[PDB]
């Protein structure tokens, strides 16, 4: 329970960090494209 | 207003020597205003028939 | 009772039955508003048939931390507590108002013995009084503390007896608070430690190891809790209004709505309600300046109304808000006010009184100064009135806005960090939650201060002079923006 | 409707003025029916805001019997269907205690300085004060404030 | 109505539902055209 | 966000009051950081999403 | 730096003569980049040292 | 300029009705749509003149 619009600012921060985290998850998930071939080359090579 | 004017058809402006616009106003009656607004006919006129 | 109670109630003053012919007069003497108590809008069983229970633990509510039980009559008197307290306010202020009205010689239609000096002022035969320090001397500034109530010295040639001890207003205030205290007590029934702090643990086994992150704050209050008067807020009486000008609002060349019947009854002669206005704030019975509606908040820089102007209602309220009751003090003057010095003076722009050449126009056997009359009517009484009215408003306006634009850093930061240090210095207090509470207090203070600043900046739209309060906001924008950014960034981080 | 009238009436409806002989009473009655002025005061209700306004205020008293006021009052009632208008989440959280009564110009009575044109006694000072300040300055200022509210 | 509006009360000539009634009439007359307009919706071949 | 911004611009223009017109400037500047924070929040949120 | 800033604020506020102070307002706006540069210099210097 | 009655040496000998206004005796006209109806907004395509 947050009094005043401290909850409103909490809402702002929560949605901001939600879409932020969405962005970093997408970006660090989409790195395999150029992340896995190099370590595969490390594996056989 | 037109009724009050016509009830005095012995004095200006409907009488005497009226200016032409005042004479025309004294002569012409008052048409219905609500009866002339019709959206369907207006839209039909605006829209090409094709 | 099971339905949702009204959120707000308004009581326009006076009250009259619709059948009564004076219904148009409803609300001329102001309006007072009060909200409901939040003990009923939330999910809470309530019925008049029999026993009724109040809710504690179980959900996120503003109620107490324990589930209690009372009777229908007890909760009935509970939801009416605001009404009873405000009615006690009204009944205790009625005697003060009656004494004040009977004091006025103008309202005394009976023959009066005093003519020019046997009384105190044209609005009061007997002086109300001014606050005095604990020395018997005149207490002008609040910073020098005032405790007693003493009559003003012989500035009118005589000293009439006072009729108040200066404790009637605060007596009503703490009477209201004492009446309110039982209801808030009943609503506030440990409270810092809850068993539900554990309910997540089992649910954690339902999720798995990856979801252990989202439980972090729970663990903070899990290894934090284990290792580990009051005054009513939210009454909503601030929204109440009282405009003394509504009495003379209808009058004019030909009077009009809303209170046109008053003008017709008085035959377009408002010479009798202007006496009411002069009893309210002292115009024009004591000059054309008077004292406007006092701002009732934490204002240690408050200035007392001295002289005959002290014998008006607004001045009396302002003076009464100053006296320190025998109880504990609650207002501390700001620890650094000379740091931000404003030598702004409105005397530089005052327009003087000028004597024009008498333009001698002669009619057959009449003669008068047409030029002098035009000069001293169009300029000395019309231009001068408007300009001086704007300056008079601007004076106290800039005083208040400067106080508000001064009070942010010192008061806010010092108090918030002091309470943060105080809660951190006690061993066992959870540091993470203490920092979080400090940050949320920072956010709350910074935002509410910003909104009040915006409100007063808007309310500073006086012509010919608000442009430079505007320039004040612009020049302060870098420094004040630094202050607010500090506050909000600290809150966000912690 | 009252646009053309003046010292001498101009475009675009000069014909209406010439029909009415530069008299506007019959049309200021139309205006007073439309929104109130001046049969119910010099200033009355304005064109209503028909957007979704949860804090709309009903007009009361005589102003309830004008077209704009009637539309405003009608816009608030709830149809027999269940309510579907969401009031603002926190109206008391954001507050603006701004009162326009602070900047009101009152009605001052000037000294009736009598001039005596042979046997005609009248004070032109009071007339000047009532005209140029009490009725020209005051009305303009009150008009600005009323629009401002 | 409002009692003692000018010293007496008179009858009211409306129910406050004429304007909203006209609004509902407009919406009801409009609905068939928009219904013809809107006429799978959750799946399209184009996506493939 | 931008529709509400455009209607804000519309009403701010529509103030233009003689004498009391400076009120829109005072309010708009005292709210520009806060309102800008709100609008930038909305716009950036939409842009990332 | 801040004493000078507060003196500037006091002078600007006290420059409220009518019909002419809008151009002292223009002066403060115009000099805002220069004053910002200088005051930022001195205040950041103090913060660093 | 020749159209202006104010520049005509001789004054009007008849009623003002035969004239158009105090600046023009014969009006210039306005653009008209391709359908010959009164053109007010240029967004609507106006082609002829009448």
PDB file of N, CA and C in Angstrom, chain C residues 35 238-241 243 245 248-249 251-253 256-257 277 288 292 363-364 366 368 370 373-374 377-378 381-382 385-386 389-390 393 397 451-452 454-455 458-463, chain D residues 38-42 62 92 94-99 101-110 113-118 124-126 128-135 137-138 141 148:
ATOM      1  N   UNK C  35     -15.537  14.769   3.473  1.00  0.00           N
ATOM      2  CA  UNK C  35     -15.632  13.456   2.858  1.00  0.00           C
ATOM      3  C   UNK C  35     -16.072  12.415   3.882  1.00  0.00           C
ATOM      4  N   UNK C 238     -10.614  21.441   3.449  1.00  0.00           N
ATOM      5  CA  UNK C 238      -9.917  22.450   2.662  1.00  0.00           C
ATOM      6  C   UNK C 238     -10.720  22.855   1.434  1.00  0.00           C
ATOM      7  N   UNK C 239     -11.481  21.924   0.857  1.00  0.00           N
ATOM      8  CA  UNK C 239     -12.286  22.229  -0.319  1.00  0.00           C
ATOM      9  C   UNK C 239     -13.426  23.190  -0.017  1.00  0.00           C
ATOM     10  N   UNK C 240     -13.712  23.447   1.256  1.00  0.00           N
ATOM     11  CA  UNK C 240     -14.753  24.397   1.614  1.00  0.00           C
ATOM     12  C   UNK C 240     -14.367  25.802   1.169  1.00  0.00           C
ATOM     13  N   UNK C 241     -15.380  26.617   0.887  1.00  0.00           N
ATOM     14  CA  UNK C 241     -15.166  27.970   0.402  1.00  0.00           C
ATOM     15  C   UNK C 241     -16.083  28.928   1.145  1.00  0.00           C
ATOM     16  N   UNK C 243     -16.989  33.090   0.279  1.00  0.00           N
ATOM     17  CA  UNK C 243     -16.701  34.311  -0.462  1.00  0.00           C
ATOM     18  C   UNK C 243     -17.513  35.466   0.104  1.00  0.00           C
ATOM     19  N   UNK C 245     -17.695  38.423  -1.001  1.00  0.00           N
ATOM     20  CA  UNK C 245     -18.165  39.308  -2.058  1.00  0.00           C
ATOM     21  C   UNK C 245     -19.507  38.886  -2.637  1.00  0.00           C
ATOM     22  N   UNK C 248     -22.479  41.328  -1.975  1.00  0.00           N
ATOM     23  CA  UNK C 248     -22.586  42.478  -2.861  1.00  0.00           C
ATOM     24  C   UNK C 248     -22.477  42.094  -4.330  1.00  0.00           C
ATOM     25  N   UNK C 249     -22.440  40.799  -4.635  1.00  0.00           N
ATOM     26  CA  UNK C 249     -22.393  40.353  -6.026  1.00  0.00           C
ATOM     27  C   UNK C 249     -23.565  40.852  -6.862  1.00  0.00           C
ATOM     28  N   UNK C 251     -25.643  43.399  -6.772  1.00  0.00           N
ATOM     29  CA  UNK C 251     -25.936  44.818  -6.918  1.00  0.00           C
ATOM     30  C   UNK C 251     -25.218  45.419  -8.121  1.00  0.00           C
ATOM     31  N   UNK C 252     -25.859  46.413  -8.719  1.00  0.00           N
ATOM     32  CA  UNK C 252     -25.304  47.074  -9.882  1.00  0.00           C
ATOM     33  C   UNK C 252     -26.225  48.181 -10.333  1.00  0.00           C
ATOM     34  N   UNK C 253     -26.026  48.635 -11.572  1.00  0.00           N
ATOM     35  CA  UNK C 253     -26.934  49.626 -12.142  1.00  0.00           C
ATOM     36  C   UNK C 253     -28.361  49.095 -12.150  1.00  0.00           C
ATOM     37  N   UNK C 256     -28.906  41.718 -10.935  1.00  0.00           N
ATOM     38  CA  UNK C 256     -29.195  40.510 -11.686  1.00  0.00           C
ATOM     39  C   UNK C 256     -28.908  39.295 -10.819  1.00  0.00           C
ATOM     40  N   UNK C 257     -29.065  38.121 -11.423  1.00  0.00           N
ATOM     41  CA  UNK C 257     -28.835  36.864 -10.732  1.00  0.00           C
ATOM     42  C   UNK C 257     -27.369  36.758 -10.303  1.00  0.00           C
ATOM     43  N   UNK C 277     -19.371  43.092   5.023  1.00  0.00           N
ATOM     44  CA  UNK C 277     -18.053  42.872   4.433  1.00  0.00           C
ATOM     45  C   UNK C 277     -16.956  43.511   5.278  1.00  0.00           C
ATOM     46  N   UNK C 288      -9.050  50.904   2.614  1.00  0.00           N
ATOM     47  CA  UNK C 288      -9.381  50.061   1.473  1.00  0.00           C
ATOM     48  C   UNK C 288      -8.416  48.895   1.314  1.00  0.00           C
ATOM     49  N   UNK C 292      -6.842  40.027   3.674  1.00  0.00           N
ATOM     50  CA  UNK C 292      -7.551  39.044   2.867  1.00  0.00           C
ATOM     51  C   UNK C 292      -7.692  37.747   3.659  1.00  0.00           C
ATOM     52  N   UNK C 363     -20.032  78.807 -16.107  1.00  0.00           N
ATOM     53  CA  UNK C 363     -21.371  78.806 -16.679  1.00  0.00           C
ATOM     54  C   UNK C 363     -21.965  80.114 -16.173  1.00  0.00           C
ATOM     55  N   UNK C 364     -23.147  80.502 -16.674  1.00  0.00           N
ATOM     56  CA  UNK C 364     -23.653  81.870 -16.554  1.00  0.00           C
ATOM     57  C   UNK C 364     -23.264  82.536 -15.238  1.00  0.00           C
ATOM     58  N   UNK C 366     -22.298  80.049 -12.592  1.00  0.00           N
ATOM     59  CA  UNK C 366     -21.672  78.918 -11.926  1.00  0.00           C
ATOM     60  C   UNK C 366     -20.202  78.831 -12.322  1.00  0.00           C
ATOM     61  N   UNK C 368     -16.700  75.905 -11.679  1.00  0.00           N
ATOM     62  CA  UNK C 368     -16.138  74.722 -11.043  1.00  0.00           C
ATOM     63  C   UNK C 368     -14.891  74.302 -11.806  1.00  0.00           C
ATOM     64  N   UNK C 370     -13.495  71.825 -13.749  1.00  0.00           N
ATOM     65  CA  UNK C 370     -13.718  70.640 -14.570  1.00  0.00           C
ATOM     66  C   UNK C 370     -12.425  69.866 -14.781  1.00  0.00           C
ATOM     67  N   UNK C 373     -11.392  68.063 -11.565  1.00  0.00           N
ATOM     68  CA  UNK C 373     -12.284  66.942 -11.290  1.00  0.00           C
ATOM     69  C   UNK C 373     -11.998  65.770 -12.221  1.00  0.00           C
ATOM     70  N   UNK C 374     -11.798  66.043 -13.513  1.00  0.00           N
ATOM     71  CA  UNK C 374     -11.433  64.980 -14.444  1.00  0.00           C
ATOM     72  C   UNK C 374     -10.111  64.337 -14.048  1.00  0.00           C
ATOM     73  N   UNK C 377     -10.476  62.300 -10.767  1.00  0.00           N
ATOM     74  CA  UNK C 377     -11.428  61.203 -10.861  1.00  0.00           C
ATOM     75  C   UNK C 377     -10.932  60.095 -11.780  1.00  0.00           C
ATOM     76  N   UNK C 378     -10.464  60.448 -12.979  1.00  0.00           N
ATOM     77  CA  UNK C 378     -10.057  59.427 -13.937  1.00  0.00           C
ATOM     78  C   UNK C 378      -8.710  58.815 -13.586  1.00  0.00           C
ATOM     79  N   UNK C 381      -8.407  58.409  -8.759  1.00  0.00           N
ATOM     80  CA  UNK C 381      -9.364  57.513  -8.130  1.00  0.00           C
ATOM     81  C   UNK C 381      -9.715  56.284  -8.956  1.00  0.00           C
ATOM     82  N   UNK C 382      -9.384  56.253 -10.244  1.00  0.00           N
ATOM     83  CA  UNK C 382      -9.654  55.101 -11.101  1.00  0.00           C
ATOM     84  C   UNK C 382      -8.367  54.359 -11.445  1.00  0.00           C
ATOM     85  N   UNK C 385      -6.724  53.486  -8.095  1.00  0.00           N
ATOM     86  CA  UNK C 385      -7.373  52.366  -7.422  1.00  0.00           C
ATOM     87  C   UNK C 385      -6.924  51.042  -8.022  1.00  0.00           C
ATOM     88  N   UNK C 386      -6.979  50.922  -9.349  1.00  0.00           N
ATOM     89  CA  UNK C 386      -6.657  49.651  -9.994  1.00  0.00           C
ATOM     90  C   UNK C 386      -5.198  49.284  -9.762  1.00  0.00           C
ATOM     91  N   UNK C 389      -4.608  48.365  -6.130  1.00  0.00           N
ATOM     92  CA  UNK C 389      -5.223  47.072  -5.857  1.00  0.00           C
ATOM     93  C   UNK C 389      -4.336  45.935  -6.346  1.00  0.00           C
ATOM     94  N   UNK C 390      -3.802  46.067  -7.563  1.00  0.00           N
ATOM     95  CA  UNK C 390      -2.885  45.053  -8.071  1.00  0.00           C
ATOM     96  C   UNK C 390      -1.646  44.939  -7.190  1.00  0.00           C
ATOM     97  N   UNK C 393      -2.487  43.203  -3.805  1.00  0.00           N
ATOM     98  CA  UNK C 393      -2.538  41.752  -3.964  1.00  0.00           C
ATOM     99  C   UNK C 393      -1.128  41.192  -4.096  1.00  0.00           C
ATOM    100  N   UNK C 397       1.067  38.160  -2.163  1.00  0.00           N
ATOM    101  CA  UNK C 397       1.259  37.084  -3.125  1.00  0.00           C
ATOM    102  C   UNK C 397       2.727  36.688  -3.211  1.00  0.00           C
ATOM    103  N   UNK C 451       3.396  20.209  -7.231  1.00  0.00           N
ATOM    104  CA  UNK C 451       2.017  20.520  -7.590  1.00  0.00           C
ATOM    105  C   UNK C 451       1.530  21.787  -6.901  1.00  0.00           C
ATOM    106  N   UNK C 452       1.890  21.986  -5.631  1.00  0.00           N
ATOM    107  CA  UNK C 452       1.509  23.229  -4.967  1.00  0.00           C
ATOM    108  C   UNK C 452       2.190  24.426  -5.617  1.00  0.00           C
ATOM    109  N   UNK C 454       3.030  24.643  -8.813  1.00  0.00           N
ATOM    110  CA  UNK C 454       2.282  24.885 -10.041  1.00  0.00           C
ATOM    111  C   UNK C 454       0.970  25.597  -9.745  1.00  0.00           C
ATOM    112  N   UNK C 455       0.286  25.191  -8.674  1.00  0.00           N
ATOM    113  CA  UNK C 455      -0.986  25.810  -8.323  1.00  0.00           C
ATOM    114  C   UNK C 455      -0.813  27.292  -8.019  1.00  0.00           C
ATOM    115  N   UNK C 458       0.094  29.314 -11.204  1.00  0.00           N
ATOM    116  CA  UNK C 458      -1.123  29.616 -11.950  1.00  0.00           C
ATOM    117  C   UNK C 458      -1.902  30.723 -11.254  1.00  0.00           C
ATOM    118  N   UNK C 459      -2.067  30.611  -9.936  1.00  0.00           N
ATOM    119  CA  UNK C 459      -2.830  31.590  -9.172  1.00  0.00           C
ATOM    120  C   UNK C 459      -2.134  32.941  -9.071  1.00  0.00           C
ATOM    121  N   UNK C 460      -0.963  33.103  -9.682  1.00  0.00           N
ATOM    122  CA  UNK C 460      -0.255  34.381  -9.707  1.00  0.00           C
ATOM    123  C   UNK C 460      -0.472  35.126 -11.021  1.00  0.00           C
ATOM    124  N   UNK C 461      -1.681  35.059 -11.579  1.00  0.00           N
ATOM    125  CA  UNK C 461      -2.003  35.676 -12.860  1.00  0.00           C
ATOM    126  C   UNK C 461      -2.474  37.123 -12.729  1.00  0.00           C
ATOM    127  N   UNK C 462      -2.080  37.822 -11.668  1.00  0.00           N
ATOM    128  CA  UNK C 462      -2.525  39.209 -11.495  1.00  0.00           C
ATOM    129  C   UNK C 462      -1.997  40.055 -12.645  1.00  0.00           C
ATOM    130  N   UNK C 463      -2.783  40.977 -13.194  1.00  0.00           N
ATOM    131  CA  UNK C 463      -2.313  41.756 -14.343  1.00  0.00           C
ATOM    132  C   UNK C 463      -1.168  42.687 -13.979  1.00  0.00           C
TER     133      UNK C 463
ATOM    134  N   UNK D  38     -29.571  38.712 -22.186  1.00  0.00           N
ATOM    135  CA  UNK D  38     -29.422  39.323 -20.869  1.00  0.00           C
ATOM    136  C   UNK D  38     -30.646  39.134 -19.982  1.00  0.00           C
ATOM    137  N   UNK D  39     -31.613  38.313 -20.397  1.00  0.00           N
ATOM    138  CA  UNK D  39     -32.823  38.135 -19.604  1.00  0.00           C
ATOM    139  C   UNK D  39     -32.535  37.499 -18.253  1.00  0.00           C
ATOM    140  N   UNK D  40     -31.378  36.865 -18.098  1.00  0.00           N
ATOM    141  CA  UNK D  40     -30.973  36.212 -16.859  1.00  0.00           C
ATOM    142  C   UNK D  40     -29.546  36.608 -16.503  1.00  0.00           C
ATOM    143  N   UNK D  41     -29.253  37.899 -16.603  1.00  0.00           N
ATOM    144  CA  UNK D  41     -27.944  38.415 -16.274  1.00  0.00           C
ATOM    145  C   UNK D  41     -27.110  38.704 -17.512  1.00  0.00           C
ATOM    146  N   UNK D  42     -26.131  39.596 -17.338  1.00  0.00           N
ATOM    147  CA  UNK D  42     -25.258  39.962 -18.449  1.00  0.00           C
ATOM    148  C   UNK D  42     -24.406  38.788 -18.909  1.00  0.00           C
ATOM    149  N   UNK D  62     -32.738  29.807 -12.563  1.00  0.00           N
ATOM    150  CA  UNK D  62     -33.309  30.271 -13.837  1.00  0.00           C
ATOM    151  C   UNK D  62     -32.494  29.864 -15.048  1.00  0.00           C
ATOM    152  N   UNK D  92      -9.348  14.313  -6.248  1.00  0.00           N
ATOM    153  CA  UNK D  92      -8.835  15.043  -5.097  1.00  0.00           C
ATOM    154  C   UNK D  92      -7.321  14.961  -4.980  1.00  0.00           C
ATOM    155  N   UNK D  94      -5.172  15.564  -7.448  1.00  0.00           N
ATOM    156  CA  UNK D  94      -4.708  16.736  -8.178  1.00  0.00           C
ATOM    157  C   UNK D  94      -5.710  17.842  -7.882  1.00  0.00           C
ATOM    158  N   UNK D  95      -5.270  18.882  -7.183  1.00  0.00           N
ATOM    159  CA  UNK D  95      -6.173  19.936  -6.745  1.00  0.00           C
ATOM    160  C   UNK D  95      -5.686  21.286  -7.243  1.00  0.00           C
ATOM    161  N   UNK D  96      -6.635  22.135  -7.634  1.00  0.00           N
ATOM    162  CA  UNK D  96      -6.363  23.509  -8.053  1.00  0.00           C
ATOM    163  C   UNK D  96      -7.332  24.417  -7.305  1.00  0.00           C
ATOM    164  N   UNK D  97      -6.915  24.890  -6.135  1.00  0.00           N
ATOM    165  CA  UNK D  97      -7.731  25.814  -5.349  1.00  0.00           C
ATOM    166  C   UNK D  97      -7.502  27.249  -5.826  1.00  0.00           C
ATOM    167  N   UNK D  98      -7.877  27.484  -7.079  1.00  0.00           N
ATOM    168  CA  UNK D  98      -7.743  28.789  -7.711  1.00  0.00           C
ATOM    169  C   UNK D  98      -9.113  29.448  -7.733  1.00  0.00           C
ATOM    170  N   UNK D  99      -9.216  30.616  -7.109  1.00  0.00           N
ATOM    171  CA  UNK D  99     -10.468  31.353  -7.021  1.00  0.00           C
ATOM    172  C   UNK D  99     -10.335  32.658  -7.789  1.00  0.00           C
ATOM    173  N   UNK D 101     -12.473  35.057  -7.466  1.00  0.00           N
ATOM    174  CA  UNK D 101     -13.012  36.129  -6.639  1.00  0.00           C
ATOM    175  C   UNK D 101     -11.924  37.053  -6.116  1.00  0.00           C
ATOM    176  N   UNK D 102     -10.671  36.600  -6.114  1.00  0.00           N
ATOM    177  CA  UNK D 102      -9.574  37.448  -5.668  1.00  0.00           C
ATOM    178  C   UNK D 102      -9.396  38.654  -6.581  1.00  0.00           C
ATOM    179  N   UNK D 103      -9.620  38.482  -7.884  1.00  0.00           N
ATOM    180  CA  UNK D 103      -9.404  39.535  -8.868  1.00  0.00           C
ATOM    181  C   UNK D 103     -10.705  40.194  -9.307  1.00  0.00           C
ATOM    182  N   UNK D 104     -11.668  40.333  -8.404  1.00  0.00           N
ATOM    183  CA  UNK D 104     -12.926  40.976  -8.752  1.00  0.00           C
ATOM    184  C   UNK D 104     -12.835  42.477  -8.522  1.00  0.00           C
ATOM    185  N   UNK D 105     -13.283  43.244  -9.510  1.00  0.00           N
ATOM    186  CA  UNK D 105     -13.378  44.692  -9.393  1.00  0.00           C
ATOM    187  C   UNK D 105     -14.766  45.046  -8.879  1.00  0.00           C
ATOM    188  N   UNK D 106     -14.822  45.679  -7.714  1.00  0.00           N
ATOM    189  CA  UNK D 106     -16.090  45.929  -7.048  1.00  0.00           C
ATOM    190  C   UNK D 106     -16.778  47.148  -7.659  1.00  0.00           C
ATOM    191  N   UNK D 107     -17.935  47.497  -7.103  1.00  0.00           N
ATOM    192  CA  UNK D 107     -18.757  48.605  -7.582  1.00  0.00           C
ATOM    193  C   UNK D 107     -18.581  49.773  -6.619  1.00  0.00           C
ATOM    194  N   UNK D 108     -17.795  50.764  -7.029  1.00  0.00           N
ATOM    195  CA  UNK D 108     -17.525  51.928  -6.200  1.00  0.00           C
ATOM    196  C   UNK D 108     -18.478  53.066  -6.536  1.00  0.00           C
ATOM    197  N   UNK D 109     -18.855  53.816  -5.506  1.00  0.00           N
ATOM    198  CA  UNK D 109     -19.706  54.987  -5.654  1.00  0.00           C
ATOM    199  C   UNK D 109     -18.831  56.231  -5.583  1.00  0.00           C
ATOM    200  N   UNK D 110     -18.855  57.031  -6.641  1.00  0.00           N
ATOM    201  CA  UNK D 110     -18.031  58.225  -6.716  1.00  0.00           C
ATOM    202  C   UNK D 110     -18.768  59.424  -6.135  1.00  0.00           C
ATOM    203  N   UNK D 113     -20.369  65.174  -7.845  1.00  0.00           N
ATOM    204  CA  UNK D 113     -19.990  66.572  -7.896  1.00  0.00           C
ATOM    205  C   UNK D 113     -20.923  67.361  -8.787  1.00  0.00           C
ATOM    206  N   UNK D 114     -21.885  68.043  -8.173  1.00  0.00           N
ATOM    207  CA  UNK D 114     -22.961  68.668  -8.928  1.00  0.00           C
ATOM    208  C   UNK D 114     -22.449  69.868  -9.709  1.00  0.00           C
ATOM    209  N   UNK D 115     -22.791  69.917 -10.990  1.00  0.00           N
ATOM    210  CA  UNK D 115     -22.652  71.122 -11.793  1.00  0.00           C
ATOM    211  C   UNK D 115     -24.053  71.650 -12.060  1.00  0.00           C
ATOM    212  N   UNK D 116     -24.162  72.969 -12.182  1.00  0.00           N
ATOM    213  CA  UNK D 116     -25.456  73.642 -12.263  1.00  0.00           C
ATOM    214  C   UNK D 116     -25.510  74.444 -13.556  1.00  0.00           C
ATOM    215  N   UNK D 117     -26.009  73.810 -14.613  1.00  0.00           N
ATOM    216  CA  UNK D 117     -26.196  74.492 -15.885  1.00  0.00           C
ATOM    217  C   UNK D 117     -27.467  75.325 -15.807  1.00  0.00           C
ATOM    218  N   UNK D 118     -27.304  76.585 -15.416  1.00  0.00           N
ATOM    219  CA  UNK D 118     -28.375  77.544 -15.176  1.00  0.00           C
ATOM    220  C   UNK D 118     -29.312  76.920 -14.130  1.00  0.00           C
ATOM    221  N   UNK D 124     -21.878  65.416 -13.296  1.00  0.00           N
ATOM    222  CA  UNK D 124     -21.246  64.677 -14.379  1.00  0.00           C
ATOM    223  C   UNK D 124     -20.091  63.821 -13.886  1.00  0.00           C
ATOM    224  N   UNK D 125     -19.545  64.114 -12.705  1.00  0.00           N
ATOM    225  CA  UNK D 125     -18.483  63.276 -12.172  1.00  0.00           C
ATOM    226  C   UNK D 125     -18.957  61.868 -11.872  1.00  0.00           C
ATOM    227  N   UNK D 126     -20.110  61.752 -11.211  1.00  0.00           N
ATOM    228  CA  UNK D 126     -20.669  60.435 -10.929  1.00  0.00           C
ATOM    229  C   UNK D 126     -21.024  59.707 -12.216  1.00  0.00           C
ATOM    230  N   UNK D 128     -19.602  60.084 -15.194  1.00  0.00           N
ATOM    231  CA  UNK D 128     -18.347  59.646 -15.799  1.00  0.00           C
ATOM    232  C   UNK D 128     -17.798  58.416 -15.089  1.00  0.00           C
ATOM    233  N   UNK D 129     -17.808  58.433 -13.755  1.00  0.00           N
ATOM    234  CA  UNK D 129     -17.296  57.295 -13.012  1.00  0.00           C
ATOM    235  C   UNK D 129     -18.097  56.030 -13.254  1.00  0.00           C
ATOM    236  N   UNK D 130     -19.426  56.147 -13.263  1.00  0.00           N
ATOM    237  CA  UNK D 130     -20.269  54.982 -13.499  1.00  0.00           C
ATOM    238  C   UNK D 130     -20.124  54.472 -14.925  1.00  0.00           C
ATOM    239  N   UNK D 131     -19.944  55.378 -15.885  1.00  0.00           N
ATOM    240  CA  UNK D 131     -19.872  54.971 -17.281  1.00  0.00           C
ATOM    241  C   UNK D 131     -18.528  54.329 -17.598  1.00  0.00           C
ATOM    242  N   UNK D 132     -17.442  55.084 -17.432  1.00  0.00           N
ATOM    243  CA  UNK D 132     -16.151  54.638 -17.941  1.00  0.00           C
ATOM    244  C   UNK D 132     -15.511  53.566 -17.072  1.00  0.00           C
ATOM    245  N   UNK D 133     -15.766  53.574 -15.768  1.00  0.00           N
ATOM    246  CA  UNK D 133     -15.162  52.585 -14.886  1.00  0.00           C
ATOM    247  C   UNK D 133     -16.154  51.536 -14.404  1.00  0.00           C
ATOM    248  N   UNK D 134     -17.290  51.965 -13.854  1.00  0.00           N
ATOM    249  CA  UNK D 134     -18.222  51.020 -13.257  1.00  0.00           C
ATOM    250  C   UNK D 134     -18.945  50.173 -14.293  1.00  0.00           C
ATOM    251  N   UNK D 135     -18.997  50.616 -15.550  1.00  0.00           N
ATOM    252  CA  UNK D 135     -19.745  49.909 -16.578  1.00  0.00           C
ATOM    253  C   UNK D 135     -18.934  49.541 -17.811  1.00  0.00           C
ATOM    254  N   UNK D 137     -14.963  49.524 -17.825  1.00  0.00           N
ATOM    255  CA  UNK D 137     -13.845  48.763 -17.278  1.00  0.00           C
ATOM    256  C   UNK D 137     -14.342  47.525 -16.544  1.00  0.00           C
ATOM    257  N   UNK D 138     -15.326  47.707 -15.662  1.00  0.00           N
ATOM    258  CA  UNK D 138     -15.784  46.605 -14.829  1.00  0.00           C
ATOM    259  C   UNK D 138     -16.376  45.484 -15.670  1.00  0.00           C
ATOM    260  N   UNK D 141     -13.539  43.592 -17.570  1.00  0.00           N
ATOM    261  CA  UNK D 141     -12.776  42.739 -16.667  1.00  0.00           C
ATOM    262  C   UNK D 141     -13.585  41.518 -16.242  1.00  0.00           C
ATOM    263  N   UNK D 148     -12.590  33.157 -18.347  1.00  0.00           N
ATOM    264  CA  UNK D 148     -11.411  32.509 -17.794  1.00  0.00           C
ATOM    265  C   UNK D 148     -11.760  31.313 -16.917  1.00  0.00           C
TER     266      UNK D 148
END
